[PDB]
Design a protein around this ligand. Sequence first.
Ligand code: NA
Ligand code: NA
Lengths: 304, 304
Amino acid sequence: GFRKMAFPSGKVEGCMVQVTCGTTTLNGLWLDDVVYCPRHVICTSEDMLNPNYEDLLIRKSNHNFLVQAGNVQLRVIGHSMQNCVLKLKVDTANPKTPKYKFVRIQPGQTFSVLACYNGSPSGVYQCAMRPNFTIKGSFLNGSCGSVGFNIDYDCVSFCYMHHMELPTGVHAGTDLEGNFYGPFVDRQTAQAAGTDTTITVNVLAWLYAAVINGDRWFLNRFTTTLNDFNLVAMKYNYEPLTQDHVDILGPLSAQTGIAVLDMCASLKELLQNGMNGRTILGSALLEDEFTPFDVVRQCSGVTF
Amino acid sequence: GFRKMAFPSGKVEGCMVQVTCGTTTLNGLWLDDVVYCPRHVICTSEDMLNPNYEDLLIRKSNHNFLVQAGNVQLRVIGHSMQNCVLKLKVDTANPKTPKYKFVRIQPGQTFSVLACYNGSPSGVYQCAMRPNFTIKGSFLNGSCGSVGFNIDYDCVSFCYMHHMELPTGVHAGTDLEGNFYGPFVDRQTAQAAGTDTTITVNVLAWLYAAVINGDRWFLNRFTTTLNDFNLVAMKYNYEPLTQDHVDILGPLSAQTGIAVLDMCASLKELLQNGMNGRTILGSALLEDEFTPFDVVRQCSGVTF
Ligand code: NA
Ligand code: NA
């Protein structure tokens, strides 16, 4: 009775276009009269270890960018770079431009990805920005320029644009101002991601979801303190829990009548003893890609 | 590198409306000049054990249906029943009507759900029609009339309309011609679902996905026969595997160079021995909600 739900994607679908530069095709985001896409579209196979993007962009003309919005070829009238994004000024404002914002999310927050190829949507899924600023995506060749987003009320908040796959098979990209999340650079080089941790406040939200949906076996009569719990968090590579995290969990704590430090004691026992061959919300692992806000939304039926 | 992906929802979003009859509000599907919704919208709390829908519908007038498409109140000019769906004829054809079909899916097939409340989309997720014709949804009060769908090329195939929650907390509903999936009736009565089984051909597709994404530990040098495997399927409540299932798995078998009866031997060992505290594609259970066609799509980047 508790699904990993993505936002409805329609408002984003009408923004996706195909961008080709030479042999390279990827996706762009068409808002008003600008198409946003990863600047690596201007690289050739010879120059991907350490591209001088300033020099490469000077070599390019508007005519070197083929932008297709379904059937419509969409004329580029100017090109500039903002950090690691290319902004292609086009002759037509997108008539399907939604109300939007560009936001830079925090590690641990969730968003929906509209995975695209050749400017065409292929599917939508929810995921988390990992504490080490990577995402565990489903992205193939041609998926670059696919975006992540949230919706609040009538407004699309774009938070992520896809650029690359790291050696470990996880994904890296930028905000819509072209700033990478994490230490990553758009050089096709071996790049270390940090140690990743589990998003504790999300695991606790997901245990609250399980209680709301009648799944209760893991509840114990014990309580803990932030200090004592964090000693166990450190041992199992869980993020430390703060009073802000307890406060954010307040609606779920009130709804269920289970204090956050009581649920922390339950999580402690799960980390120490495992699940003894049992399941929670039809999973045999502790799930960390639901924010408290995602659980409240899905348990209260919030719409857009 | 392998996510449960929903279809892009935009073409469906423009079809969702709010339907109110008395105190009851749920969702409707506005295609051309017809709004489709669950006929139980016409029930009162006194008549939900065994409604005489023919008598109840005769008592209703067009004026007893309030249909809202965002702001627009949308005038009902006729009402009829097709099996367990109400068809409300409206004075305006939906200008956002997509290319569509109504299809009745098979048990074991997947589809996306656009979960709606008050005619407004809340989120989209992928799920399977269980072998016992239930769905393991995420549906709250007010979610009735939310639909399930597939997209092939440019065409929305509607396959499911949500009606009710069964005692076990799983969900039941109809095709868009109003015929229930499974033995269920629109009476708010205790109703048995069959024994459910695991969708073997989907588990094997998902093991092929794991191999494609480098997750390989469970592969063994052994092979089996359909007969010998099915003896183990029966023991663990897995659907029996047919030569049609082997043939459908052919692209995944060819891609990976692993014969279906070789993967069957791997699945046999997983059922008999469990996962020994290991994970496949970041799961500690065998996942059965990916069809062979879903894995091929997600591994080849098919778009719409
Ligand atoms: Na041009
Ligand atoms: Na009317």
